[PDB]
């Protein structure tokens, strides 16, 4: 089309029934854990949202 062709063309994938990421302070706690407590692995450098290791 020549008026929002792309929105109509895509396949609608459905929201997966995943568990709630808890609200308020819980989230903050989780974030903290992710950051400073657990300490993510680094070959040389830190990274917040890593990739599946590939090109």
């Amino acid at each position: 089309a020549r008026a929002g062709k792309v929105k109509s063309q895509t396949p609608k994938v459905e929201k997966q029934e995943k568990p709630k990421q808890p609200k308020g302070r819980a989230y903050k706690r989780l974030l903290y854990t992710r950051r400073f407590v657990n300490v993510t692995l680094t070959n040389g450098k830190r990274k917040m949202n890593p990739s599946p290791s590939s090109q």
């Binding site: 020549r2 008026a3 929002g4 792309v6 929105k7 109509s8």
Partner: protein, 145 residues
């Protein structure tokens, strides 16, 4: 060099005058003074304006990126002036339709163009009392025709 401006202890009025004079080179200040917004500027120096959709018009974009930018020729209600409002997101123009009331907003640049869409200054926000973004989302539905 004493550097232009009078540094005397009683040279204050003159200084003030000079400052005032200078003020008329500053563009924003000038605008504020003369009421360019109140005398021109399709809107009445306002945030928004309701306007009637006269027709749907695809406008060809500036350069680099090449496309048709699905704008609308809007007639503002309060003044009677005629402007061109870009319509955001996928489709959206269909939703807007034709001869509808349409609540416009400024595009962002305190007047002026917005990037690539030449001769275009306004976002359509609401069409006949809803909201375009909302419509696009389908979080809220249109009130029929």
């Amino acid at each position: 060099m004493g550097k232009g401006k009078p540094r005397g202890l009683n040279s204050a009025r003159k200084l003030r005058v000079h400052r005032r004079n200078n003020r008329w080179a500053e563009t924003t200040y000038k605008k504020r003074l003369l009421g360019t917004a109140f005398k021109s500027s399709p809107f009445g120096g306002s945030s928004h304006a309701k306007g009637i959709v006269l027709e749907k018009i695809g406008i060809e974009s500036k350069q680099p990126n090449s496309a048709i930018r699905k704008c609308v020729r809007v007639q503002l209600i309060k003044n009677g002036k005629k402007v061109t409002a870009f319509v955001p997101n996928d489709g959206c123009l269909n939703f807007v339709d034709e001869n509808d009331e349409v609540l416009l907003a400024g595009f962002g640049r305190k007047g002026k163009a917005k990037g690539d869409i030449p001769g275009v200054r306004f976002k359509v926000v609401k069409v006949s009392g809803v909201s375009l973004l909302a419509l696009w989302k389908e979080k809220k539905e249109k009130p029929r025709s």
